[PDB]
Amino acid sequence: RNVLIVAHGQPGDPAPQQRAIEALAARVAPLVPQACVRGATLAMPGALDRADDETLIYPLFMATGWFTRSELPRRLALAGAPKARILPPFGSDPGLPALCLALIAQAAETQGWPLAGTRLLVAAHGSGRSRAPSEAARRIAAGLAPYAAAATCGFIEEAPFIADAARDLPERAICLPLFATQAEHVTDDLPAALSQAGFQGLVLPPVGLAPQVPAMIAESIKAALS
Ligand code: NA
C-alpha cells in the first residue's frame, strides 16, 4: 500500500529537487489506485521518515550496487523502516529498452531521417566504483543497434568518455541521455561534453522526463504488490 519513489540527491537547494520527485509520484499515483504513492529526494533531510516496514521503495537509480544493497537499507533502518522492501531500480526496469526505442524512433521521424540510416549515442553517468551502470548502458545500446545504423555509449565517469564517444559522428545522429532525473542530468553538463566533441546530431531530453515513465513505474509497483 505505501510506496515511496526515491531519487538520489544532488548539490544545491533540495526544495526544487523534492518538488520534481513529488510531481513524478503524482503522475504515477492515478495509475496505482491500490497504493498511496509519494516522492522523495535524498537531498532533503528526513526524506525517508514517512516510510515504515510495510513501505515499498522504487529507487530512481541506474543500477543495483552498494547503495541499493547496503546504504539505502541503512538510511531506511535508522529512519524506523528496516523491513522496507526495495524494488528493482529505474535502470533495470523491464520497460526501459522499449521506452528508449520509442523516443529515438519518434525523434528520427520528426527529423525526416530513416532510423536504419541514423547513428545512436547512449550518454550516461557510468561509475568509477562499479561495472553495473556501464554494462546496463551497453545492454541498452545493443538492444537499439538492430533498428539503427549503429549504437554506442559515452560516459561521464569512465571510458569511453562522452567527449571521445561523440567525436567524428555524422550529422544524422541522435544522443539519448540515460538519466533518471533532470537534477542528475544537469550536474553532468552533457552540452559542454558534446560541444567539445563537435557533436552535430540531435540531443534529446533525459529519458526520466519521458511521458511514458509514470506508466512504466506504475507497472513495476503493481507487479510487486499482492
Ligand atoms: Na516507430
Numbering used by the authors: 3 to 228
Text taken from the publication that reported this structure:
The final step involves the insertion of iron into sirohydrochlorin and is catalysed by a sirohydrochlorin ferrochelatases.
In addition, with this purified sample, crystals were grown and the crystal structure of Pp-CbiX was determined to a resolution of 1.9 Å. The overall structure of Pp-CbiX is characteristic of the type II class of metal chelatase enzymes. A search of the PBD using PDBeFold (EMBL-EBI) showed that the full length Pp-CbiX protein is most similar to CbiK from Salmonella enterica, a cobaltochelatase (Se-CbiK). Splitting the structure in this way identified the most similar structure to the Pp-CT domain as the CbiXS protein from Archaeoglobus fulgidus (Af-CbiXs, with a metallated sirohydrochlorin bound), with an RMSD of 1.88 Å. The structural overlay shows the metallated tetrapyrrole fits into the central cavity in Pp-CbiX and indicates that the active site residues in Pp-CbiX are located in the CT half of the protein, similar to Se-CbiK but unlike CbiXL and SirB that have active site residues in their NT. The overlay highlights the conserved position in the active site of the (His127) residue of Pp-CbiX with the equivalent His residue in Se-CbiK (His145), shown to be involved in metal binding in the bound tetrapyrrole. So it is feasible that (His187) of Pp-CbiX is also at a very flexible region of the structure, and this crystal form has captured the (His187) residue in an inactive conformation in which it is moved out of the way of the active site.
